[PDB]
Short mmCIF file of C-alpha atoms and ligand atoms in Angstrom, two decimals:
data_model
loop_
_atom_site.label_atom_id
_atom_site.label_comp_id
_atom_site.label_asym_id
_atom_site.label_seq_id
_atom_site.Cartn_x
_atom_site.Cartn_y
_atom_site.Cartn_z
CA UNK A 1 209.44 191.15 292.55
CA UNK A 2 206.43 189.59 294.23
CA UNK A 3 205.55 185.92 294.19
CA UNK A 4 201.96 184.76 294.05
CA UNK A 5 201.05 181.15 294.85
CA UNK A 6 197.96 179.94 293.00
CA UNK A 7 195.90 177.03 294.27
CA UNK A 8 194.27 175.81 291.09
CA UNK A 9 195.67 175.32 287.60
CA UNK A 10 192.76 175.66 285.22
CA UNK A 11 190.94 178.72 283.82
CA UNK A 12 190.70 180.76 286.98
CA UNK A 13 194.39 179.91 287.45
CA UNK A 14 195.34 180.89 283.93
CA UNK A 15 193.72 184.31 284.27
CA UNK A 16 195.37 185.02 287.63
CA UNK A 17 198.64 183.73 286.21
CA UNK A 18 198.27 185.76 283.07
CA UNK A 19 197.59 188.94 285.08
CA UNK A 20 200.33 188.26 287.64
CA UNK A 21 202.83 188.16 284.79
CA UNK A 22 201.58 191.51 283.48
CA UNK A 23 202.22 192.85 286.98
CA UNK A 24 205.59 191.11 286.67
CA UNK A 25 205.11 188.78 289.63
CA UNK A 26 206.55 185.28 289.74
CA UNK A 27 203.79 182.71 289.60
CA UNK A 28 203.87 179.52 291.66
CA UNK A 29 201.18 176.91 291.01
CA UNK A 30 199.93 174.21 293.30
CA UNK A 31 197.56 171.65 291.80
CA UNK A 32 196.79 168.00 292.65
CA UNK A 33 196.66 167.12 288.95
CA UNK A 34 200.04 166.26 287.32
CA UNK A 35 198.44 167.27 284.06
CA UNK A 36 197.19 170.61 285.46
CA UNK A 37 196.19 172.75 282.43
CA UNK A 38 198.63 175.67 283.05
CA UNK A 39 201.38 173.55 284.58
CA UNK A 40 203.94 174.80 282.03
CA UNK A 41 202.61 178.35 282.01
CA UNK A 42 203.43 178.93 285.68
CA UNK A 43 207.01 179.79 286.68
CA UNK A 44 207.05 176.97 289.27
CA UNK A 45 204.68 174.02 289.66
CA UNK A 46 204.11 171.90 292.77
CA UNK A 47 201.90 168.90 292.26
CA UNK A 48 200.07 168.04 295.47
CA UNK A 49 196.64 168.01 297.02
CA UNK A 50 196.51 170.78 299.66
CA UNK A 51 193.96 168.91 301.82
CA UNK A 52 196.27 165.86 301.87
CA UNK A 53 199.53 167.75 302.37
CA UNK A 54 198.61 171.03 304.02
CA UNK A 55 202.11 171.41 305.41
CA UNK A 56 203.66 171.83 301.94
CA UNK A 57 201.35 174.76 301.33
CA UNK A 58 201.93 176.45 304.69
CA UNK A 59 205.59 176.06 303.87
CA UNK A 60 205.23 177.61 300.42
CA UNK A 61 203.36 180.32 302.27
CA UNK A 62 206.49 181.24 304.15
CA UNK A 63 208.12 181.95 300.82
CA UNK A 64 205.46 183.80 298.86
CA UNK A 65 203.79 187.20 299.10
CA UNK A 66 200.22 185.88 298.83
CA UNK A 67 198.15 182.74 298.29
CA UNK A 68 195.30 182.95 295.83
CA UNK A 69 192.81 180.09 295.76
CA UNK A 70 191.60 179.70 292.16
CA UNK A 71 189.34 176.66 292.18
CA UNK A 72 185.71 175.98 292.99
CA UNK A 73 186.26 172.71 294.71
CA UNK A 74 184.24 173.19 297.86
CA UNK A 75 186.21 170.64 299.83
CA UNK A 76 189.33 172.63 298.95
CA UNK A 77 187.82 175.96 299.94
CA UNK A 78 186.34 174.78 303.22
CA UNK A 79 189.57 173.13 304.03
CA UNK A 80 191.55 176.27 303.23
CA UNK A 81 189.09 178.14 305.47
CA UNK A 82 189.77 175.90 308.42
CA UNK A 83 193.57 176.49 308.20
CA UNK A 84 193.73 180.04 306.84
CA UNK A 85 194.91 181.55 310.13
CA UNK A 86 198.21 179.59 309.80
CA UNK A 87 199.46 181.04 306.53
CA UNK A 88 202.43 183.39 306.79
CA UNK A 89 201.04 185.51 303.99
CA UNK A 90 197.60 186.98 303.11
CA UNK A 91 195.05 184.64 301.62
CA UNK A 92 193.30 186.63 298.94
CA UNK A 93 189.82 185.23 299.46
CA UNK A 94 186.55 186.11 301.18
CA UNK A 95 185.15 182.78 302.53
CA UNK A 96 181.81 184.09 303.88
CA UNK A 97 181.17 185.88 300.55
CA UNK A 98 182.03 182.65 298.75
CA UNK A 99 179.55 180.81 300.95
CA UNK A 100 176.67 182.99 299.76
CA UNK A 101 177.89 183.21 296.17
CA UNK A 102 178.34 179.52 295.31
CA UNK A 103 174.73 178.80 296.26
CA UNK A 104 172.43 180.40 293.65
CA UNK A 105 169.24 180.30 295.83
CA UNK A 106 171.13 181.80 298.75
CA UNK A 107 172.52 184.47 296.40
CA UNK A 108 168.96 185.17 295.42
CA UNK A 109 167.82 185.53 299.00
CA UNK A 110 170.71 187.94 299.40
CA UNK A 111 169.63 189.96 296.31
CA UNK A 112 166.09 190.22 297.66
CA UNK A 113 167.13 191.22 301.16
CA UNK A 114 168.85 194.29 299.77
CA UNK A 115 166.23 195.18 297.14
CA UNK A 116 168.08 194.06 294.02
CA UNK A 117 165.87 192.72 291.16
CA UNK A 118 166.47 189.15 290.09
CA UNK A 119 164.61 186.70 287.83
CA UNK A 120 161.30 185.62 289.33
CA UNK A 121 161.24 182.08 290.67
CA UNK A 122 158.96 179.25 289.56
CA UNK A 123 156.98 181.12 286.95
CA UNK A 124 154.10 179.30 285.35
CA UNK A 125 154.59 180.46 281.81
CA UNK A 126 157.18 178.87 279.57
CA UNK A 127 159.94 179.42 278.94
CA UNK A 128 161.78 178.59 282.16
CA UNK A 129 165.44 179.01 282.60
CA UNK A 130 166.65 176.08 284.63
CA UNK A 131 170.10 175.48 286.08
CA UNK A 132 171.75 173.70 289.03
CA UNK A 133 172.15 175.58 292.35
CA UNK A 134 175.96 175.60 292.78
CA UNK A 135 177.77 175.30 289.47
CA UNK A 136 179.64 177.65 287.14
CA UNK A 137 180.64 177.92 283.47
CA UNK A 138 176.85 177.38 282.93
CA UNK A 139 177.19 173.67 283.54
CA UNK A 140 173.59 172.39 283.43
CA UNK A 141 172.14 175.78 282.40
CA UNK A 142 169.20 175.08 280.07
CA UNK A 143 166.15 176.66 278.52
CA UNK A 144 162.88 174.72 278.82
CA UNK A 145 159.70 175.11 276.77
CA UNK A 152 161.84 165.81 286.55
CA UNK A 153 164.79 168.02 287.47
CA UNK A 154 165.80 168.07 291.14
CA UNK A 155 163.95 169.45 294.14
CA UNK A 156 166.81 171.90 294.26
CA UNK A 157 167.22 172.86 290.59
CA UNK A 158 166.63 176.54 290.14
CA UNK A 159 163.65 177.25 287.83
CA UNK A 160 163.48 180.92 286.77
CA UNK A 161 161.75 183.16 284.35
CA UNK A 162 163.73 183.29 281.15
CA UNK A 163 165.14 186.80 280.90
CA UNK A 164 166.13 187.85 277.42
CA UNK A 165 168.73 190.46 276.71
CA UNK A 166 172.43 190.96 277.15
CA UNK A 167 174.53 189.24 279.81
CA UNK A 168 176.77 191.77 281.53
CA UNK A 169 179.53 191.52 284.07
CA UNK A 170 181.18 193.73 286.65
CA UNK A 171 184.01 192.79 289.04
CA UNK A 172 184.24 194.47 292.47
CA UNK A 173 187.32 194.43 294.66
CA UNK A 174 186.64 195.22 298.30
CA UNK A 175 188.93 195.61 301.28
CA UNK A 176 186.14 195.42 303.83
CA UNK A 177 185.63 199.18 303.85
CA UNK A 178 185.83 200.43 300.31
CA UNK A 179 184.50 198.75 297.28
CA UNK A 180 186.06 199.38 293.91
CA UNK A 181 183.66 198.68 291.03
CA UNK A 182 185.76 198.21 287.93
CA UNK A 183 184.73 197.67 284.35
CA UNK A 184 181.54 196.47 282.63
CA UNK A 185 181.88 193.69 280.09
CA UNK A 186 179.67 191.94 277.61
CA UNK A 187 179.47 188.19 277.96
CA UNK A 188 178.84 186.50 274.61
CA UNK A 189 177.22 183.12 275.11
CA UNK A 190 176.95 180.09 272.89
CA UNK A 191 174.24 177.47 272.36
CA UNK A 192 175.34 175.86 275.62
CA UNK A 193 174.99 179.16 277.50
CA UNK A 194 178.75 179.07 277.82
CA UNK A 195 180.92 182.10 277.22
CA UNK A 196 182.95 182.07 274.03
CA UNK A 197 183.66 185.83 273.80
CA UNK A 198 183.96 188.90 275.97
CA UNK A 199 183.98 192.59 275.01
CA UNK A 200 183.95 195.81 277.11
CA UNK A 201 180.87 198.02 277.69
CA UNK A 202 180.26 201.72 278.43
CA UNK A 203 179.69 202.80 282.02
CA UNK A 204 176.30 201.86 283.48
CA UNK A 205 175.70 203.75 286.82
CA UNK A 206 172.71 201.68 287.96
CA UNK A 207 174.72 198.42 287.41
CA UNK A 208 177.65 200.05 289.18
CA UNK A 209 175.54 201.09 292.20
CA UNK A 210 173.91 197.70 292.50
CA UNK A 211 177.33 196.00 292.37
CA UNK A 212 178.59 198.39 295.05
CA UNK A 213 175.69 197.57 297.32
CA UNK A 214 176.09 193.82 296.84
CA UNK A 215 179.73 194.24 297.83
CA UNK A 216 179.19 196.75 300.62
CA UNK A 217 176.48 194.74 302.40
CA UNK A 218 178.69 191.70 302.74
CA UNK A 219 181.05 193.69 303.34
CA UNK A 220 183.40 192.29 300.65
CA UNK A 221 187.09 191.85 301.30
CA UNK A 222 188.37 190.19 298.19
CA UNK A 223 186.97 189.93 294.66
CA UNK A 224 183.45 189.20 293.35
CA UNK A 225 181.78 189.42 290.03
CA UNK A 226 178.20 190.32 289.38
CA UNK A 227 176.42 189.00 286.29
CA UNK A 228 173.21 190.67 285.14
CA UNK A 229 170.83 190.41 282.20
CA UNK A 230 169.68 193.68 280.72
CA UNK A 231 166.11 192.48 280.29
CA UNK A 232 163.08 194.01 278.72
CA UNK A 233 161.71 195.01 282.13
CA UNK A 234 165.04 196.28 283.40
CA UNK A 235 168.22 194.93 284.88
CA UNK A 236 168.18 191.54 286.62
CA UNK A 237 171.14 190.23 288.57
CA UNK A 238 171.32 186.47 287.98
CA UNK A 239 174.36 185.54 290.03
CA UNK A 240 177.47 186.65 291.86
CA UNK A 241 180.67 184.71 292.05
CA UNK A 242 183.07 185.68 294.91
CA UNK A 243 186.30 184.25 293.52
CA UNK A 244 188.79 185.20 290.89
CA UNK A 245 187.07 185.06 287.52
CA UNK A 246 188.37 183.98 284.13
CA UNK A 247 187.94 185.68 280.72
CA UNK A 248 186.71 189.11 281.87
CA UNK A 249 189.73 190.40 283.82
CA UNK A 250 191.88 190.27 280.69
CA UNK A 251 189.37 192.47 278.87
CA UNK A 252 189.12 194.72 281.94
CA UNK A 253 192.92 194.98 281.79
CA UNK A 254 193.20 196.14 278.20
CA UNK A 255 190.02 198.26 278.19
CA UNK A 256 190.34 199.91 281.55
CA UNK A 257 194.04 199.67 282.37
CA UNK A 258 193.36 198.03 285.73
CA UNK A 259 195.00 194.74 286.74
CA UNK A 260 192.57 192.92 289.11
CA UNK A 261 195.35 190.81 290.61
CA UNK A 262 197.17 194.00 291.48
CA UNK A 263 193.91 195.45 292.88
CA UNK A 264 193.09 192.26 294.77
CA UNK A 265 196.61 192.23 296.25
CA UNK A 266 196.25 195.82 297.40
CA UNK A 267 192.88 195.07 299.04
CA UNK A 268 194.66 192.83 301.57
CA UNK A 269 197.63 195.22 302.08
CA UNK A 270 197.32 198.99 301.39
CA UNK A 271 193.56 198.97 301.06
CA UNK A 272 191.75 200.06 297.92
CA UNK A 273 190.11 203.29 296.77
CA UNK A 274 186.67 203.54 295.22
CA UNK A 275 185.92 203.95 291.43
CA UNK A 280 191.74 204.07 280.06
CA UNK A 281 188.89 203.63 277.66
CA UNK A 282 190.48 201.29 275.13
CA UNK A 283 188.87 198.42 273.32
CA UNK A 284 189.53 194.71 273.48
CA UNK A 285 188.19 191.52 272.01
CA UNK A 286 188.64 188.23 273.75
CA UNK A 287 187.49 184.92 272.27
CA UNK A 288 187.94 181.14 272.03
CA UNK A 289 188.12 179.29 268.75
CA UNK A 290 188.50 175.53 268.36
CA UNK A 291 190.70 174.39 265.48
CA UNK A 292 188.24 171.88 263.99
CA UNK A 293 188.83 169.21 261.34
CA UNK A 294 190.49 170.75 258.25
CA UNK A 295 191.11 173.74 260.50
CA UNK A 296 187.62 175.11 260.37
CA UNK A 297 187.39 177.41 263.40
CA UNK A 298 184.49 177.07 265.80
CA UNK A 299 183.73 179.20 268.82
CA UNK A 300 183.69 177.32 272.03
CA UNK A 301 183.01 178.08 275.66
CA UNK A 302 185.07 177.52 278.75
CA UNK A 303 183.58 174.06 279.20
CA UNK A 304 185.66 172.95 276.19
CA UNK A 305 188.90 174.82 276.86
CA UNK A 306 188.74 173.22 280.29
CA UNK A 307 188.82 169.71 278.77
CA UNK A 308 192.30 170.57 277.37
CA UNK A 309 195.62 169.01 278.31
CA UNK A 310 198.18 171.86 278.03
CA UNK A 311 197.67 175.60 277.84
CA UNK A 312 200.28 178.21 277.00
CA UNK A 313 201.21 181.12 274.77
CA UNK A 314 201.09 180.48 271.04
CA UNK A 315 201.78 183.79 269.39
CA UNK A 316 202.08 187.48 270.11
CA UNK A 317 202.50 190.70 268.18
CA UNK A 318 201.43 194.26 268.97
CA UNK A 319 197.73 194.29 269.86
CA UNK A 320 197.49 190.49 269.56
CA UNK A 321 197.93 187.66 271.98
CA UNK A 322 197.16 184.04 271.17
CA UNK A 323 197.19 181.10 273.57
CA UNK A 324 196.87 177.44 272.62
CA UNK A 325 194.99 174.95 274.64
CA UNK A 326 196.21 171.59 273.34
CA UNK A 327 194.06 168.47 273.41
CA UNK A 328 191.21 166.76 271.58
CA UNK A 329 191.04 169.53 268.99
CA UNK A 330 193.16 172.46 270.01
CA UNK A 331 191.47 175.64 271.25
CA UNK A 332 192.90 179.09 270.56
CA UNK A 333 192.21 181.94 272.99
CA UNK A 334 192.68 185.19 271.11
CA UNK A 335 193.05 188.59 272.69
CA UNK A 336 193.04 191.72 270.61
CA UNK A 337 193.19 195.28 271.72
CA UNK A 338 193.61 198.83 270.53
CA UNK A 339 192.49 202.44 271.02
CA UNK A 340 189.00 201.78 269.61
CA UNK A 341 186.73 199.14 268.05
CA UNK A 342 188.27 199.93 264.67
CA UNK A 343 191.89 199.17 265.37
CA UNK A 344 190.91 196.25 267.55
CA UNK A 345 188.91 194.84 264.68
CA UNK A 346 191.93 195.42 262.50
CA UNK A 347 194.07 193.41 264.96
CA UNK A 348 191.42 190.73 265.13
CA UNK A 349 191.78 190.49 261.32
CA UNK A 350 195.57 190.28 261.40
CA UNK A 351 195.39 187.63 264.14
CA UNK A 352 192.92 185.46 262.26
CA UNK A 353 195.06 185.81 259.17
CA UNK A 354 198.06 184.63 261.17
CA UNK A 355 196.16 181.43 262.03
CA UNK A 356 194.76 181.26 258.53
CA UNK A 357 197.88 181.73 256.39
CA UNK A 358 200.37 179.94 258.63
CA UNK A 359 198.37 177.37 260.57
CA UNK A 360 195.79 176.40 257.93
CA UNK A 361 192.81 177.91 259.71
CA UNK A 362 189.58 179.00 257.98
CA UNK A 363 186.95 181.31 259.51
N1 ANP B 401 167.13 183.50 284.18
C1 ANP B 401 167.88 183.44 283.06
N2 ANP B 401 167.38 183.80 281.86
C2 ANP B 401 168.12 183.75 280.73
N3 ANP B 401 169.40 183.33 280.69
C3 ANP B 401 170.03 182.94 281.82
C4 ANP B 401 169.29 182.97 283.09
N4 ANP B 401 170.15 182.52 284.01
C5 ANP B 401 171.34 182.24 283.42
N5 ANP B 401 171.25 182.48 282.10
C6 ANP B 401 172.30 182.28 281.08
O1 ANP B 401 173.08 181.13 281.42
C7 ANP B 401 174.41 181.54 281.75
C8 ANP B 401 174.91 180.80 282.98
O2 ANP B 401 174.14 181.19 284.11
P1 ANP B 401 174.78 181.87 285.43
O3 ANP B 401 173.57 181.88 286.34
O4 ANP B 401 175.46 183.18 285.14
O5 ANP B 401 175.79 180.97 286.29
P2 ANP B 401 177.12 180.08 286.32
O6 ANP B 401 176.96 178.75 285.65
O7 ANP B 401 177.41 179.71 287.85
N6 ANP B 401 178.21 180.74 285.21
P3 ANP B 401 179.45 181.72 285.80
O8 ANP B 401 179.02 183.24 285.53
O9 ANP B 401 180.49 181.21 284.68
O10 ANP B 401 180.23 181.38 287.03
C9 ANP B 401 174.35 183.05 281.94
O11 ANP B 401 175.59 183.66 281.60
C10 ANP B 401 173.23 183.47 281.02
O12 ANP B 401 173.66 183.57 279.65
N1 ATP B 402 192.50 170.19 297.14
C1 ATP B 402 193.16 170.60 296.03
N2 ATP B 402 194.52 170.68 296.02
C2 ATP B 402 195.20 171.08 294.92
N3 ATP B 402 194.60 171.43 293.76
C3 ATP B 402 193.24 171.39 293.64
C4 ATP B 402 192.43 170.97 294.80
N4 ATP B 402 191.14 171.02 294.40
C5 ATP B 402 191.12 171.44 293.10
N5 ATP B 402 192.37 171.66 292.66
C6 ATP B 402 192.73 172.10 291.31
O1 ATP B 402 192.14 173.34 290.94
C7 ATP B 402 191.78 173.30 289.55
C8 ATP B 402 190.33 173.72 289.36
O2 ATP B 402 189.49 172.89 290.15
P1 ATP B 402 187.89 173.03 290.03
O3 ATP B 402 187.27 171.92 290.84
O4 ATP B 402 187.54 174.47 290.30
O5 ATP B 402 187.57 172.82 288.47
P2 ATP B 402 187.23 171.39 287.83
O6 ATP B 402 187.00 171.58 286.35
O7 ATP B 402 186.17 170.72 288.66
O8 ATP B 402 188.62 170.59 288.02
P3 ATP B 402 188.68 169.00 287.72
O9 ATP B 402 189.53 168.86 286.47
O10 ATP B 402 189.33 168.38 288.94
O11 ATP B 402 187.22 168.64 287.54
C9 ATP B 402 191.98 171.87 289.07
O12 ATP B 402 193.19 171.83 288.32
C10 ATP B 402 192.12 171.09 290.35
O13 ATP B 402 192.99 169.98 290.22
N1 ORD B 403 182.90 187.35 285.15
C1 ORD B 403 182.19 186.65 284.06
C2 ORD B 403 183.05 185.45 283.59
C3 ORD B 403 182.22 184.15 283.45
C4 ORD B 403 183.14 182.90 283.58
N2 ORD B 403 184.33 183.02 282.69
C5 ORD B 403 183.44 182.68 285.06
O1 ORD B 403 184.63 182.56 285.49
O2 ORD B 403 182.45 182.63 285.84
MG1 MG B 404 178.28 181.56 287.93
MG1 MG B 405 177.12 182.39 285.68
#
């Protein structure tokens, strides 16, 4: 049995934790927040700030197989970077890749320098898509029809949002599984589903990874626009939502793959279906789709229910949020499981959708 130590107890952390358990690893969580979201989901939980008490972490590091940072707190990351050489286990992170990826303008310079199409900056014609430079979860993302000098203003590119994760080991870059990112009115993601292979997207994602070169995990988001594919961002860190769907649809566990990238090495390159979504239990148990930004306001997050083809997790708080996962051999069965799941909530927990 392997033990993974996660630094970060929210959504990134949940996904890593969730996938570590499928790989049957013990999961140890470090988080500075006593009310860390997944605090009861992890096998062990140590509440401390790693910048304040680095020694506790280095110590943990003597007793785990790997440390995975799963937060986007730049102080935390830079700090981890400055002490990484002292861990007694691999640190499953690419810090240089993260440096380009967290800055959206920098990421766009990177796209351009390797010939990858990306929304045009500062167009004159409305609409403009505008969003902060270094956020995630689409915090601040907005359509427009006095921002900052550094706000990104882009052409609005209509069409589907699509995601691919790549795991690299520095030499080989394993492009995994395409997913469809369903967005809500806040440009947040409330649902993910898997897509058919897309070779162009796959080759672009390989090049992005290979020119770093990536050692660790990144995701590539693209919009399939009316004038072709446009990469809008990359995020070099363990993602939430999509790896679960990649797991059921493709059979690949990204935590497993990420762990191999820093040990064995990885090699390059199922076809089941999976639906993954968030639904807020609203007043009178009317169900409302919500994005990550809501789920992440929660107070406790753990497993609620499971039967074959159906997992349900409850994020407790100011209106509970349910994360549902359904899967099966094809869209049909999955849809059938989605129905059974909803009817579990409906008949037993008073829900209505
Ligand atoms: N130029 C654009 N045109 C149209 N929609 C866009 C554009 N840029 C971003 N979006 C939408 O807004 C969402 C958030 O933008 P994105 O640039 O992917 O970064 P992020 O906030 O750092 N989110 P993440 O993928 O969670 O880490 C995207 O998923 C798209 O749905
Ligand atoms: N230096 C640190 N030491 C320990 N845990 C940390 C540190 N920095 C962040 N975390 C934890 O990682 C998780 C995700 O942090 P991140 O900043 O990516 O998201 P966030 O939504 O901004 O978190 P927060 O609730 O603090 O705003 C949080 O639970 C946070 O407490
Ligand atoms: N890889 C696409 C996932 C988007 C969002 N859940 C995130 O972690 O950025
Ligand atoms: Mg992003
Ligand atoms: Mg994004």
